[PDB]
Design the sequence.
């Protein structure tokens, strides 16, 4: 009562017992603390099977295995911004059928020597559809995503893809190779658009972080013997309630072949990977003239 | 219009070309008005 | 549901039965175009082969939604995805997916 | 009970006593029939002063005389399409802040020899703003309008404008002058866009209908001694719940000087007429790729 409630943990659900001799709560000691979101839970695990019984959003419809094969990113469904979490006093627009629909980006071909690609969100959809037009016309943007990476192969084909969602996928460079150049990735590399960008070093994910630990991020496998597609339900993950859709990407979708594609000669050599994705609970605010970038 | 989302992928031993049978219908909300002579087929000769 | 003759290209009597199905095959993976047709049941074209189209010839005005079912008739090993897009009026034939 | 209820007056509020000897109600005789919208009512007359106390819609704000100087077209406020009146099973999008806002078109100059101009709706807004983008992207459109024609003049200037709303303002031609050519007006004349089109014969309104009876349509005067602006609240008037915004214009806004502009030399000769208008209760349906026309 006699102290300012201005610590970094006010508003949390954790009760902290602390020692403070000053006016401010942040001056106090760290003290004591008086399914699981991180394991890429399924829709059945999160109990969201009712919203998943038919993946039809807007005016689009995809078909896949239900519930168990629907990865909800961090166990949280996309939602509109709550009244307390939002800061902008302007009321947002909710098109909800012209922006919350499945958009099909491109048809990148999986090869035996394929290294992998990444797609930045919502950079992939900035110049596509009513969602793209709302992204250019509005300063503020907020949406979840339902990304459905599709890769059909016969039962004689083999291989696996780590279809993963890396939030705030900052791209690093080779720094001239020797590491003493301080180069920075260009706009076509940081924001490659709907066409995506092929990974130069998928082992370090072009950021100095191993792909072996990419599974701590929301992810799903496209092991060809088991499933032919991966559906990841990504919520809006940002330090802010809203953000610009043009100069900040909330997350990068990593589609990397961990197990290489392999088949004997006579089967179809064209094994394409299709990125179909739907914004969920899309919000736009701060309306002005449309700007591409 | 029908577009290839990814591809038509087949292994060794499967045919490289398949076919799709489009079957068109109407929903329960379908309704009709103003009965008229059909013009999809026109017999110009007399039936013997 | 009645067979929609999307592939109403062939005219010869020996190839008339090919109108009921349309080919799908391995492409270059660039979102290639498979088949287009107008969504009008009473219009002259693919929809005349349907019972809905032939009955639509007997009625001037129609309303309601339309069901077009695409049945894949490939191998059980044959796999892939198609983007079947219905364009509302005003939009021309899309040049790409 | 024994007759089909298939006359043209089923669903009306008028009880008709009729004589019928057939199965169908439309075979029956005309029979007997067992403020006022047409006089361009004000907002005070319609009792809509609460919605008019501050004309702020979306992110825009205009200033004028309230209630008495707000002409509600045909005594009906714009509204979303009711569930029974709509036919399209697709659910419409309601942006409601990016499309329901005042758009300022152009600054046509009133002259002493000025003849008048017309603006077609929503043709004026097909290539303007999020409303224009929704008009191109969606097949179906439905909106009312709040048109605020602004013409400021000093108290030493004189003149009047019949700012009027003519529903389904079909443009006729001179037919070669002699009347035996059957010419038709071009696209720049039928749909002149936001720039408008100057009237060639404002007496017949370029349609063979006198301007003296234009006041049966929703209208307001800009008699310069009394008011400097006219605010007309137009609802969606069509035979259909929805229509294309690109190849059908619901109404034409007629701004014609009935009393000519006149002033002595020394006052400002530039007396401009500004068209500021806001879609009201705008609905868009039938979403596809964006088409300009």
Sequence:
């Amino acid at each position: 009562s006699h102290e300012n409630s201005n610590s970094a943990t006010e508003g949390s659900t954790i009760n902290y017992t602390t020692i403070n001799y000053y006016k401010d709560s942040y001056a106090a000691t760290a003290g004591k603390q008086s399914a699981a979101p991180l394991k890429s839970p399924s829709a059945e695990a999160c109990g969201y099977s009712d919203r998943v019984a038919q993946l039809t959003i807007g005016n689009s419809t995809i078909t896949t295995q239900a519930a168990a094969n629907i990865i909800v990113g961090y166990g949280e469904w996309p939602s509109y911004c709550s009244d307390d979490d939002a800061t902008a006093v302007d009321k947002p627009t909710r098109p909800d059928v012209s922006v919350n629909r499945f958009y099909t980006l491109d048809t990148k071909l999986w090869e035996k020597s394929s290294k992998g690609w990444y797609w930045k969100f919502p950079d992939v959809l900035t110049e596509t559809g009513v969602f793209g037009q709302n992204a250019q016309f509005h300063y503020l943007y907020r949406s979840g995503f339902c990304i459905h990476v599709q890769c059909n192969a016969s039962k004689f084909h083999q291989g696996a893809l780590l279809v993963a969602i890396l939030p705030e996928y900052v791209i690093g460079t080779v720094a001239g190779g020797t590491g003493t150049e301080d180069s920075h990735p260009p706009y076509i590399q940081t924001q490659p658009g709907a066409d995506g960008f092929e990974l130069q070093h998928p082992y370090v994910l072009d950021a100095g972080i191993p792909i072996s630990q990419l599974t701590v991020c929301p992810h799903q496998w496209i092991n060809l013997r088991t499933n032919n597609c991966a559906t990841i339900i990504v919520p809006y993950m940002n330090t802010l309630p809203f953000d610009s859709a043009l100069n900040h990407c909330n997350f990068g979708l990593l589609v990397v072949p961990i197990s290489p594609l392999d088949f004997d000669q006579g089967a179809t050599p064209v094994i394409p990977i299709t990125i179909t994705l739907a914004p969920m609970c899309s919000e736009f605010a701060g309306l002005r003239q449309a700007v591409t970038q | 219009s029908i577009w290839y989302q990814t591809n038509y992928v087949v292994p060794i031993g499967a045919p490289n070309t398949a076919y799709i049978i489009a079957l068109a219908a109407a929903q329960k909300n379908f309704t009709m008005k103003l009965c008229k002579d059909t013009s999809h087929i026109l017999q110009t000769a007399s039936i013997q | 549901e009645t067979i929609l003759e999307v592939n109403n290209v062939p005219t010869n009597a020996t190839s008339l039965m090919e109108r009921l199905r349309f080919p799908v095959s391995a492409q270059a993976g660039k979102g290639e175009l498979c088949a287009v047709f107008r969504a009008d049941p009473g219009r002259d074209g693919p929809w005349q082969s349907t019972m809905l189209g032939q009955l639509c010839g007997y009625y001037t005005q129609w309303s309601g939604s339309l069901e077009v079912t695409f049945m894949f008739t490939g191998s059980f090993m044959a796999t892939g995805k198609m983007l079947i897009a219905y364009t509302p009026p005003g939009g021309p034939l899309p040049k790409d997916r």
About this structure: The two ends of chain C are 27 Å apart (CA to CA).
